[PDB]
Amino acid sequence: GAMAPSYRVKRMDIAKNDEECVVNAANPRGLPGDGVCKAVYKKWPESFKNSATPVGTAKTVMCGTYPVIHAVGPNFSNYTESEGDRELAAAYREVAKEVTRLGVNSVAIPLLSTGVYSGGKDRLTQSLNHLFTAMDSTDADVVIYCRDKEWEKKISEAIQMRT
Ligand SMILES: [Cl-]
Ligand SMILES: [Cl-]
Ligand SMILES: [Cl-]
């Protein structure tokens, strides 16, 4: 584990991360997709071999020795708020199991279901709080990746508030 397990936020492309493994905001089919998924596909295309997995699950595939954890959050266009909330919490619980199993000391993670799977709603707080619920019991350094300047500030405020 990390000597003093921490949360940090970075506003940059998760394909450029400085961590021991990455979480992909994957689709269920293991397709190249859009947004974070497409960036992940460009950087680590070998990790898409048999990466298809259901909503609410995570499946790790190695790119060389570098683990890509494909985490499938729900598309809120299709799920009810209630069922989508359940599957989004479940996806993050499966990420925490994989990060523990891998024995990594750090992980790069995006906010699942916040972009094209958001169903047009701001889900920063919902998705970040499910991330915390799952990752708080892990000892990996967690680095959250985002692109929006206002989101970076809000994620940073949420991390510091708990410390
Ligand atoms: Cl960048
Ligand atoms: Cl998304
Ligand atoms: Cl963002």
UniProtKB/Swiss-Prot annotation:
Effect of residue 117 to A: Partial loss of mono-ADP-ribosylhydrolase activity; complete loss of ADP-ribose 1'' phosphate phosphatase activity
Phenotype when changing residue 117 to V/W: Almost complete loss of mono-ADP-ribosylhydrolase activity
Superkingdom, natural source: Viruses
Membrane-topology descriptor: Peripheral membrane protein
Subcellular location: Host cytoplasmic vesicle membrane
Listed result of changing residue 13 to A: Partial loss of ADP-ribose 1'' phosphate phosphatase activity
Residues at which ADP-D-ribose binds: 13, 27, 35, 115-117
Residue intervals of the Macro domain: 4-163
Post-translational modification: Phosphorylated by host on serines and threonines.
Free-text note regarding domains: In the N-terminus, the macro domain displays a mono-ADP-ribosylhydrolase activity. The central part called, the alphavirus unique domain (AUD) has a zinc-binding function. The C-terminus region, also called hypervariable domain (HVD), is mainly disordered and binds several host proteins. This intrinsically disordered domain contains 2 SH3 domain-binding sites and 2 FGDF motifs necessary and sufficient for the formation of nsP3/G3BP complexes.
Described function: Seems to be essential for minus-strand RNAs and subgenomic 26S mRNAs synthesis. Displays mono-ADP-ribosylhydrolase activity. ADP-ribosylation is a post-translational modification that controls various processes of the host cell and the virus probably needs to revert it for optimal viral replication. Binds proteins of G3BP family and sequesters them into the viral RNA replication complexes thereby inhibiting the formation of host stress granules on viral mRNAs.
Subunit (UniProt): Interacts with mRNA-capping enzyme nsP1. Interacts (via C-terminus) with host G3BP1; this interaction inhibits the formation of host stress granules on viral mRNAs and the nsp3-G3BP1 complexes bind viral RNAs and probably orchestrate the assembly of viral replication complexes. Interacts (via C-terminus) with host G3BP2; this interaction inhibits the formation of host stress granules on viral mRNAs and the nsp3-G3BP2 complexes bind viral RNAs and probably orchestrate the assembly of viral replication complexes. Interacts (via C-terminus) with host NAP1L1.
Protein's UniProt name: Non-structural protein 3
Organism classification: Viruses, Riboviria, Orthornavirae, Kitrinoviricota, Alsuviricetes
Span within the parent record: 1334 to 1493 of 2474
